[PDB]
Write a protein that binds this ligand. Structure first.
Ligand SMILES: [Zn+2]
Length: 1369
DNA sequence: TCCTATATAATAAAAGA
């Protein structure tokens, strides 16, 4: 009403003294000098006379001239025609002959390979194109109504350009060059060709509106590995021929950093030439951002850059691509190589340093790239956002705001000739002034109560309108716990027209409807559903009960208004707040979050880079109707985003910054040193102090610091130059976090516990000292303080095993408990029960109770084997230590040679050919990249080659080092190890990832000697992991050739499901795969598609077709629709058919192989319960104890134990496990991969007792050994959850039914697929069908729904969706 | 919206109330 007045910017009256520049009053900085317009007084024009803009072009740009309308419509084409330089593009040529240059979207482009390099080697060039987006007018353009600039206009501009432009004499215009290319083509008879670009639209857009001419009309499409804009692009200059000298070359190449590129590329914007602003005239030398900043500003004198219609959009989008690429490359080029080594190691090396010895010291570290989109930067932002939630608790309010193009402030400023779409600068500046005002109201004015913490991220839509998502964590006093509070903040109904007319109009247009969420929300094909026909229903109450985990607000039926000749009721009014909507006239949606799980989904807004789209380029021939089509997946940048990034405007803001503290052993710190300056490091080392060491000094000299614990010191002090100083500026609170340390180093784990609970430590000695008595080790000190976990559960588990009387298993149980579970005192258990553990060894070696030596040693050695695989040693656990024995893997050379000869004879013809190529490469002495990828359907053929190759190489005396991506795959291969263990790659795997293996370590020597390295499942391996293997191999060898010139055999099948990513769309997922990595070019493909099926050869052929998406028989009914063979479909209950009518303890072994597969985990849990009920037996309930590892005692209050019990994150055991004798169970942890236990290893329960479960292995090498599985501590694999849940439960899950993606490696004799809803991934259906060898053994049941079931109404046949991404295969 | 392989340790740079 009168009280609420719309926010007014106040006009552009204010101007800076240093330079004339019209700026809004709010934008003025505190100092009084505007940074963007002139960098204070630092930026000034050079003293060169500035020519006036030519009159004829100015009259055309304004509407005054008669032919002005035509000029504005064709500005993109006219500018390109008179330009002196061109951009290269790669397009396939029909008939093998193409014109030298072709026109795409109104800009001249030249085929890659038009200029052949004098060196004779052609650099790879990334592809960047400018796309018009609104090519709906192509049909009118094709029609000869005008669409030629009227001819007279072209002649008049051409005459003006020659008279006023000096460059014309030196360089020919593109329009003349294009004619010459056509003339050469005409003589050869090469046909004229037309090139067109199309975008497959994404499902995210404003409802019913996309690609609006008003929202955007120009964009850059670019493809690069990490989404960074490409530095290397091809620009070719055509030079007018000189009669005097034939030496001059017509084609020369200029890089993105050529000095006068701007004047050459865009002639209309700078007509006079390389004079005035076209030449370098910025003074006091000026960075690229500063130059663009000066030009894109509004001043009284006419500015060509902001008043040129479509060209203005192209200039801004092209300039952002050039500026970002130049900054990223310059920073990377000017980077010193850095190496990190511990202080103890460097000092030891220096004392024993060999004179004149060149040895690399330490591990290489690669510093992060500047671009925000790069993976490492994004991961840090997510971790920082997560800790604000952990400390301040669950978020209370989520608010989203979107720009309105018809806002009064944007319209009044625009001059009559300009249109909102043509000028991007005003939209970005007005939005920033408004967002800052709303942000201030919420926090500075305490709107919606006191706000403690805030996170805000701005993302641009395909239309290009900017929208910002804000999350607010309120203080405890104002937290919303009542229906009365929820109603005042959020309202979901149409306002009374008489009571509040202005509000009624704002709600009527901005928030009238929400797109119905039925497969496609934006598409208006569901016209009825699009407006007022959506999920919300008349609840009639605030009901903040989290029924579905989302509160449902009050909606009352019976109120409706007329919009677009339609009636929309209270069913669909997006939740809106009155004061905010009245003040800023734009769509503001306020929603309340009442579940911590709701944030888990919402936090993913901060994980994106640029918008992702799919573009297909087609070349067509007029003479004959021949078209060639190619598919490119590339990032998209709109014009409004580019102006936002070019100016210094923030895209992410967090209220509290985070400082990371360090936990280090007493003599080991971290020093980072440049490789060349080794001598300086020795002097610098004494001075360097890490955060922990500094804390000791602050305690020694300051009384006040004693009160705070080590974790809280960052909040009250700041670190500069290796010292801590008090902070008196009232600066942004910094939270402070301590990292988590793993049990692999026991002392460091004990140190973390002491720092968390001990305060006022003068020096390391004080931390160990407790109650006036020093203790020799950190572990002893912790026990006396009493901050250690109880070991009662472990003692009981060991006692039960002794009663069982099976000795070998008891020794294994001790190893599994110590490595995975954390035992405070392992030594005590071993000493008390030593006789029971070593009883078997005593009986065989020394008859009955004989007295001899090494009986204990033999027992300890068996336990040590499990420790070696995980990397721990017996000394760490304080067990008695005996020196390790030595054995040789190669064994008999004669035996390996004889076995190899027989295997070679049985190989198939395609297989034999592969053996010959791999053997030849090992013999060849030339230094050339030697990487081979073995393709072909996943199956028996690939494994047999690995066996024959290993035998042949061992026979010649060389060594092979087999490794595999998954634990189950590793068990099959001899001596299998997970590739993440062999090369010790970091678990997050960001772009800057380096292997932790030491160059001089014994393991490194083994990799150097090995002739061949084999990876069983490349499909699972991500691009980052393959890159890290390349760096380590290059470092160990002296060569710089890819992969150290070592033969590699990364066999894999790409039809199977790709590696899961936390959030991505089709365009995002394809780029991270091995195919889009740079090293892929060197790889040479060997094909092994010969099919090896014991029976039902027809079934194998059908599987390949489903995987390749070649089945198009029913595609006519719908896209991606296939028909299952009739015999397989089963109306009857899938449980009865797949597992058999009879399920009993007596016959469980016969039906053990069979299993049921379902797409979503929820359905799987329901099926498992029913089968368990039918089985005879008595239910035993094993409960679990769950805790959150935390740096703060209060953090536990925010997430209560009752909440932790309910959550069951993927890859973790259930809180309440119900199991009965004869059930099938699957291990969820690798444990001992070599012996047989793995990520699968399904077992049949034999006996169940408290604290111990006895099972028999149904799959893998063990095949029937009896293993006892103890409780172990399991932690969530994903980092999405804010807290780290440590839950101890038997690592087991009921396994009668498994999700399709958990069954990639298992082989099942009979399988039944139950599909409640259609599949949603890369290889989902293919994996489910592939498990069974023959067609008769698959039974499928489909539930009828909108997209699946009997799609033809009169046809009794069932159709299901098959999803395959064509680009990956 | 969903699905979840591996399973240990986490960067050099100035400046404000
Ligand atoms: Zn200025």
């Amino acid at each position: 009403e009168d009280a609420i007045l719309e926010h007014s910017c106040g006009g552009m009256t204010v101007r800076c003294e240093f330079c004339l520049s019209l700026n809004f009053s709010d934008e003025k900085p505190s100092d009084g000098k505007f940074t963007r317009c002139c960098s204070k007084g630092k930026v000034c024009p050079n003293d060169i006379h500035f020519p006036d803009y030519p009159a004829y072009l100015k009259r055309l740009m304004t509407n005054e001239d008669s032919d002005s309308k035509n000029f504005m419509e064709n500005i993109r084409s006219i500018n390109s025609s008179f330009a002196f330089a061109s951009m290269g593009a790669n397009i396939a040529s029909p008939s093998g002959y193409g014109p030298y240059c072709f026109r795409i979207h109104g800009q001249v482009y030249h085929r890659t390979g038009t200029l052949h390099p004098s060196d004779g080697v052609s650099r790879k060039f990334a592809q960047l194109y400018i796309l018009d987006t609104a090519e709906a007018t192509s049909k009118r353009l094709a029609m000869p109504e005008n669409q030629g600039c009227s001819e007279r206009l072209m002649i008049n501009i051409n005459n003006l350009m020659h008279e006023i432009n000096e460059l014309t004499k030196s360089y020919k215009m593109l329009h003349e060059v294009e004619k010459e290319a056509q003339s050469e083509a005409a003589a050869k008879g090469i046909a004229p060709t037309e090139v067109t670009m199309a975008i497959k639209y994404d499902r995210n857009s404003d409802p019913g509106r996309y690609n609006s001419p008003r929202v955007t009309e120009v964009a850059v499409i670019f493809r690069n590995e990490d989404g960074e804009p490409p530095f290397e692009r091809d620009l070719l200059i055509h030079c007018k021929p000189d009669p005097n000298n034939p030496n001059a070359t017509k084609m020369k190449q200029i890089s993105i950093l050529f000095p006068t590129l701007d004047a050459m590329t865009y002639p209309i914007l700078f007509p006079h030439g390389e004079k005035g602003w076209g030449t370098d005239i910025a003074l006091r030398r000026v960075t690229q951002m500063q130059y663009y900043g000066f030009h894109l500003s509004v001043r009284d004198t006419f500015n060509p850059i902001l008043n040129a219609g479509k060209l203005t959009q192209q200039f801004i989008v092209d300039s952002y691509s050039k500026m970002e690429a130049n900054r990223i490359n310059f920073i990377k080029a000017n980077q010193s190589k850095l190496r990190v080594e511990k202080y103890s190691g460097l000092m030891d090396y220096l004392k024993s340093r060999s004179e004149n010895d060149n040895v690399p010291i330490g591990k290489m570290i690669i510093l992060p790239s500047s671009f925000e989109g790069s993976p490492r930067n994004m991961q840090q932002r997510y971790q920082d956002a997560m800790a604000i939630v952990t400390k301040y608790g669950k978020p209370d309010l989520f608010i989203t705001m979107t720009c309105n193009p018809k806002w009064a402030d944007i319209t009044n400023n625009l001059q009559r000739w300009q249109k909102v779409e043509n000028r991007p600068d005003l939209v970005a500046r007005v939005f920033n002034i408004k967002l800052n005002a709303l942000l201030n109201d919420i926090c500075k004015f305490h709107l919606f109560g006191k706000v403690i913490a805030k996170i805000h991220v701005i993302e641009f839509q395909k239309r290009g309108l900017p929208h910002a998502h804000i999350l607010l964590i309120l203080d405890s006093e104002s937290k919303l716990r009542s229906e009365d509070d929820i109603d005042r903040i959020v309202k979901a109904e149409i306002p009374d027209e008489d009571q509040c007319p202005r509000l009624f109009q704002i709600v009527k247009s901005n928030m009238v409807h929400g797109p119905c969420g039925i497969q496609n929300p934006n598409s208006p094909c569901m016209e009825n559903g699009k407006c007022s026909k959506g999920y919300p229903k008349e609840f009639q109450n605030a009901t903040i009960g989290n029924i579905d985990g989302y509160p449902k607000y009050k909606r009352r039926s019976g109120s409706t208004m007329s919009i677009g000749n339609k009636v929309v009721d209270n069913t669909w009014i997006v939740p809106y707040n009155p004061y905010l909507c009245l003040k800023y006239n734009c769509h503001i949606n306020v929603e309340v979050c009442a579940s911590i799980k709701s944030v888990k989904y919402l936090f993913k807004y901060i994980y994106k880079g640029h918008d992702c789209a799919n573009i297909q380029i087609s070349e067509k021939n007029i003479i004959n109707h021949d078209e060639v089509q190619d598919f490119i997946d590339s990032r998209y940048v709109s014009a409004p985003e580019a102006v936002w990034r070019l100016f210094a405007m923030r895209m992410h803001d967090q209220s509290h910054a985070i400082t990371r503290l360090a936990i280090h052993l007493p003599n080991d710190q971290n020093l980072y040193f440049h490789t060349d300056d080794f001598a300086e490091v020795l002097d610098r080392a004494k001075r360097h102090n890490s955060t922990l060491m500094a804390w000791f000094l602050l305690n020694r000299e300051d009384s006040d610091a004693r009160n705070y614990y080590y974790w809280e010191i960052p909040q009250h002090y700041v670190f500069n130059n290796s010292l801590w100083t008090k902070r008196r500026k009232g600066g942004n609170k910094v939270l402070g976090r301590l990292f988590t340390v793993s049990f692999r180093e026991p002392e460091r784990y004990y140190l973390r516990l002491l720092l968390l609970h001990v305060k006022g430590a003068i020096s390391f000695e004080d931390l160990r000292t407790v109650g006036g008595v020093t203790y020799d080790t950190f572990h002893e000190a912790a026990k006396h303080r009493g901050l250690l976990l109880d070991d009662t559960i472990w003692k009981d588990t060991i006692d039960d095993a002794i009663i069982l009387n099976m000795p070998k298993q008891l020794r294994q149980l001790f190893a599994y408990i110590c490595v995975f579970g954390c035992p405070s005192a392992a030594d005590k258990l071993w000493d008390e029960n030593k006789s029971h553990f070593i009883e078997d060894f005593c009986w065989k070696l020394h008859r009955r109770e004989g007295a001899c030596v090494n009986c204990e040693m033999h027992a300890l050695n068996e336990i040590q084997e499990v420790f070696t695989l995980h990397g721990m040693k017996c000394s760490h656990f304080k067990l008695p230590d005996y020196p390790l024995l030595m054995n040789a893997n190669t064994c008999d050379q004669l035996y390996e040679q004889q076995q190899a000869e027989v295997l070679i004879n049985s190989l198939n013809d395609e297989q034999l050919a592969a053996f010959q190529t791999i053997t030849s490469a090992i013999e060849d002495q030339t230094v050339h990249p030697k990487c081979f990828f073995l393709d072909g359907p996943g199956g028996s053929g690939q494994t047999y080659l690995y066996k024959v190759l290993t035998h042949y190489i061992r026979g010649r005396g060389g060594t092979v080092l087999p490794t595999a991506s998954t634990g189950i795959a590793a068990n099959l291969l001899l001596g299998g190890r997970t590739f993440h263990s062999q090369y010790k790659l970091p678990i997050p795997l960001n772009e800057t990832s380096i292997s932790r293996l030491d160059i001089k370590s014994e393991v490194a020597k083994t990799i150097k000697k090995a002739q061949l390295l084999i990876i069983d499942e490349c499909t699972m391996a991500s691009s980052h992991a393959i890159n890290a293997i390349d760096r380590l191999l290059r470092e160990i060898m002296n060569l710089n050739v890819a992969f150290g010139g070592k033969v590699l055999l990364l066999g894999g099948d790409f039809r199977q499901c790709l590696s899961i990513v936390p959030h991505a769309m089709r365009s995002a997922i394809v780029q991270t795969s091995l195919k889009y990595c740079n090293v892929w070019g060197c790889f040479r493909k060997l094909s092994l598609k010969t099919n090896m099926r014991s029976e039902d050869s027809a079934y194998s052929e059908w599987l390949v077709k489903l995987g390749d998406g070649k089945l198009d028989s029913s595609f006519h009914l719908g896209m991606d629709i296939i028909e299952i063979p009739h015999e397989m479909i089963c109306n009857g209950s899938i449980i009865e058919a797949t597992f058999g009518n009879s399920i009993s303890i007596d016959n469980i072994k016969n039906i053990s192989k069979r299993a049921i597969l379902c797409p979503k985990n929820e359905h799987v849990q329901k099926l498992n319960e029913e089968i368990l009920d039918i089985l005879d037996g008595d239910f035993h309930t094993y409960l679990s104890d769950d805790s959150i590892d935390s740096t703060d005692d209060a953090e536990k209050e925010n997430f209560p134990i009752e909440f932790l019990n309910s959550i069951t994150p993927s890859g973790m055991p259930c809180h309440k496990l119900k199991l009965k004798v004869g059930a099938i169970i699957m291990l969820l942890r690798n444990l001992n991969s070599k012996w047989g236990l793995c990520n699968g290893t399904r077992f049949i329960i034999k006996r169940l007792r408290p604290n111990i479960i006895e099972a028999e292995v149904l799959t893998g090498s063990a095949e029937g050994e009896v293993v006892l599985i103890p409780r172990i501590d399991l932690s969530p694999s994903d980092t999405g959850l804010p807290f780290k849940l440590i839950r101890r439960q038997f690592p087991v899950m009921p396994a009668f039914a498994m999700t399709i993606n958990k069954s990639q490696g298992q082989t099942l004799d009979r399988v039944g697929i139950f599909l409640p809803e259609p599949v949603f991934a890369h290889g989902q259906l293919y994996v489910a069908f592939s498990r069974v060898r023959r067609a008769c053994d698959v039974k499928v049941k489909v539930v009828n729904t909108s997209s699946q079931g009997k799609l033809v109404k009169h046809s009794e046949s069932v159709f299901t969706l098959n999803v395959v991404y064509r680009e990956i295969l």
